[PDB]
Symmetry: D3
């Protein structure tokens, strides 16, 4: 009784799941835990059980882009996952303030996908669980890692054309901090299925004009903290 | 140099502002503080300086509905206000779980207004500041008052007709907790102007099928806590 | 058996109602009638029975903005009101032609609200009753007061930002005369509930780059004329 | 220097124009005037100069549907026409009240076209000139012909399918009286170009479940009345 | 048992129909066939039975614009027509490449109408039948007539205003070749009713900055080829 | 000078590219060619040079979903690819007619993504190149493999919820044949960048109520045929 795309079973699903885009990132994360168990690898979806600080939680890759990741997240959320934290990279939308390697823990997101709109009307917020956000922030503080907080623009467009103007500049003026491609989708799906979500991101560019290791530490720390509550 | 609709001046604006819909509610709130100073009353917008736990903060009425309240909130946000907490009433969207007199502290809202859409594209979240939410929650806990947390549906429609179906049932299924008329507007305006916002509401009905005093205590407590940081 | 927000009863509702935004305006209007009876004051909604030229009609304040005023107008329309005329202020959209203190009697309006869209699809016109418009015009003429006629832009945005362009310039080029915030809402609600509506406005600004007394006279005149038909 | 589709020249354009859909209707109208002059016939656009009650005005066919008629109306409005009255047939949207052969003089219309939306944002009303409406009504009264007044639903769909529900039932509940295909387009174009418009229609069906001659008389009467003002 | 607007009967409908906008074009086409039979002329809809290369097919005029032509096309498609090819004129959207008199055979179209949107959601393509396109192309080649291939922008706006920008420039950059007013409507209706459609157009202008006879030959050739299959 | 996500270089890009969703599918395809060269594997994007019938063309995996695949397709289209054919699986939208294992070669698609809408207005068709479609069809015929032809619904939603109705039933009634998740995106991107595209799909389910090998043969055959033209 395996999940259709993750090819893992319901019993293999822990309460806390760390998600990342790249299956290769799962491999670099697992070796930084105390131990791990490889579970499956199907398409872009790679699943490993991570063991860290006496706690147990999966790390799963979701692929690039909202529709791809919705299949991952739906399979998790409908099969016992209670907390999903996305860790990844992003573009800065405030290049004067937030620079290469800076880390942003996000509370909400702009819904520039389609799938969330196929699930619920556009007016509904893409918003993470406060507790997951508080936990992520507290782990950062404990490790003395400075971080930013803010809204991420989640967009299905990576390569713009020159016909329809990009809204990234509008959202920068609206004080959105960063840009990526899956957080909003995660948050809407999460909310609809009673799954607590959050997101922590490392800036690796700007669309306009050691830190990684720390980001990962923060994310694994938050997962261990959250996991403790369900064990 | 008075504000056009609030008829108060920039110097009279404290860092923290409590907002409520009804000017009569301002009067019932002020007398529960240690002392107060009546500042102005113009149209539906009543402003009083509240004194509570050694702290100083305004209580301002915003009127019914999103466009009316946007004029209030814009005048505050553009003239020195740093934290705005809305306190009011709402309908329950989960009548089995959340009942008459229950109190909900909200993290985000559904944007069923127009004014927010005239300010920023629909995909952008209506989301409150986490710190304001954490503060509100902590005051509740300190007073041993149980509370719910969740998304509020902010709608410009109070009296439905029978032509266009209401989305309230959709949003209830999407796990939105409550319904009111101004929170989303507050949150978008707040975000756009770098003003930290939040909302605490008391259930007084359902669109489908002592506690007040406690709500007010929580709200005044959070305002005093937040105010301390800027004095 | 009181109306929920107006706090008046069905029997207190006359066939003709004059509506204005500001409760203070009700007070300045009532004293210009032959006599009056104060009925209620709840939130921003102030109701007074006006007596003028042997006729009987209410003057009710509706607050600022479309959602707020929809609660007022729905309570009136569902409880026996047959004719509602809004009197108020507006911005000029044709500053070369229509200046400070000029009076505009409006036949239709731009629906830049939300509530009307929650009632009926966007394609439907916001249009006043011709008879109410003809009456308003005829009273103006009788008093030898010059007036303009045209479409009003009804917008939920008073304070623009600099992200999303305002449509006010588009509508000025489309030959819309004035701008305000509630007429469209009135007209749609009116049409949906078989209530005859209209609007007369005095210019008090421009968003781009004695007369009051006369406006009020015109409005009270039209109300007396219309009221005569139902008594 | 002929108009591109009407194949008439600017000098041949009178201040008042009667428009109808069918070129054959122009022929049946012209012979009921005192005299006439055939001007042109190109595609569906037939133009004749009508002479009636000592007055001079064109009767022009506009074809079926909004985009077709917009070319007619734009050529008229940009080349000296001041008043355009559409006369035609329609479906009843209130079959209990308004029956086969009843005549409706319309004040406004539902914009279920595209071309008007390519000219101006959806929120803007399709509304006729009050004076043209008053004139049409007064001619009816003079001839003792009973008439209805109301909003027409102007739709680009004549033959519905069974996938997307028709809004005709919604608009019937919204108290729209009749349905046709060009009035809204006329009214928007009219408003944008400072041309006074109106519409008088005879019911010839229902989408749900002697009089002609009188309609035509009313229309020719109104044209003669309006024309007198510019001669 | 006549069709309501075409005024022909079901038995008079051939499997292949050539459609054109102008009823006068039907007259110039019929005389180029081997023989013909005039069937009807009602409003802008002129129907003639064409006889060419031993084959039998109608030529029908559809009028200007999408809503008008939808009535024509629906009456054909619901009454036995299997193949509809539109032949007409268009504007070039690539003036450097495609010039006056050049001929474009179109595979798909931009849906800038309303009626198609009243039939099926905007996301659905306006696309012709490949076989009809292949046939049209092969007839061109047989007659050694050079042709272009591409998407046509079908727009309900002929005369732009200066408020809402035209999308024609956007679609030119998107590599749309030509512009006209009815192809998209034909293609959607065709697809919905299982009718095979296509379009061949001759450039006669640009919105920016012998060949006819050949176009007609190509169109009559394709109709004869297609007709052979059903006889 | 490697492509950012494909991690191949411009010189490694052939004129014809076969694309598939699953990187594992690339592996099963390559071994069926005469020979191959593994080029790269980064994230879900696996690239191999295929050698077949004396011809040279890449096979590249694009991942699940529209936004993910747009990064793949944009990198190809902007770096020398002239023909992209997608081969994959789909759901049947006509379960009576089109069954498990049946193969559909698609001419156009429904744009239920977001990224295409961020590139060009919704009215623009998602349509493949006719020549690629003709080639695919001819290879099928040569191998005596029966196939269907039609429109695919491309949707970003795989797992529906029960709040917002799925349009799949609407599109089935509109005669769309199949459903998948990337074809529309491919086709729009293709059209915008002057890249010829197409799609061949094998039915493996229905959302309502040997053949593989043949599909692959057809796809490799079409790629070899198309490649011959550029070598
Ligand atoms: O989402 C991450 C990301 C996205 C985008 C955006 F969507 F705006 F173009 N920009 C990114 C940037 C950018 F340079 F800011 F543009 C840097 C790092 C990651 C980015 C990447 C997207 C490609 C796949 C990996 N995630
Ligand atoms: O926003 C509060 C409120 C709104 C609405 C809604 F918008 F859904 F109809 N319902 C409320 C309810 C309701 F009964 F749940 F419907 C109770 C108490 C306050 C409500 C009120 C609205 C009227 C003015 C005072 N705030
Ligand atoms: O609706 C009236 C009004 C509105 C607006 C608009 F919505 F465009 F900004 N502009 C007004 C102006 C303006 F100056 F034209 F902008 C003058 C007087 C009244 C105005 C005011 C709005 C604030 C509350 C009282 N009614
Ligand atoms: O606009 C007139 C008309 C339209 C429509 C509608 F658009 F709803 F289907 N219904 C009509 C009806 C109808 F029967 F009510 F449906 C009767 C007479 C004229 C009608 C006709 C439409 C066909 C061309 C002549 N005008
Ligand atoms: O559709 C044909 C057409 C349309 C348009 C457009 F819709 F863009 F304005 N432009 C055309 C042009 C134009 F000059 F390119 F603008 C030339 C020839 C026919 C055109 C004409 C439209 C008027 C009625 C006859 N078909
Ligand atoms: O796009 C293919 C596909 C999609 C969908 C849809 F989007 F409707 F749900 N349904 C599919 C079906 C379905 F069973 F018809 F629902 C079968 C096989 C592939 C399908 C799959 C989607 C998951 C990732 C692989 N492609």
């Amino acid at each position: 009784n395996l999940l259709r795309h993750l090819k893992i079973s319901k019993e293999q699903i822990t309460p806390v799941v760390l998600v990342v885009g790249d299956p290769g990132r799962v491999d670099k994360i697992k070796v930084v835990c105390d131990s791990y168990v490889d579970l499956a690898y199907n398409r872009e979806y790679k699943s490993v059980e991570c063991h860290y600080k006496g706690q147990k939680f999966l790390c799963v890759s979701h692929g690039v882009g909202s529709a791809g990741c919705a299949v991952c997240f739906e399979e998790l959320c409908q099969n016992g996952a209670k907390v999903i934290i996305r860790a990844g990279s992003c573009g800065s939308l405030q290049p004067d303030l937030i620079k290469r390697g800076d880390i942003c823990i996000c509370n909400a997101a702009v819904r520039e996908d389609r799938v969330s709109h196929l699930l619920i009307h556009g007016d509904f917020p893409a918003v993470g669980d406060f507790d997951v956000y508080d936990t992520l922030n507290k782990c950062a503080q404990e490790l003395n890692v400075p971080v930013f907080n803010g809204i991420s623009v989640s967009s299905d467009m990576y390569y713009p054309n020159k016909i329809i103007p990009s809204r990234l500049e509008d959202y920068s003026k609206a004080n959105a901090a960063v840009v990526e491609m899956e957080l909003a989708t995660l948050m809407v799906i999460g909310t609809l299925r009673k799954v607590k979500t959050g997101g922590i991101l490392i800036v690796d560019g700007c669309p306009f004009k050691h830190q990684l290791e720390n980001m990962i530490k923060i994310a694994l720390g938050a997962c261990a903290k959250l996991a403790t509550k369900y064990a």
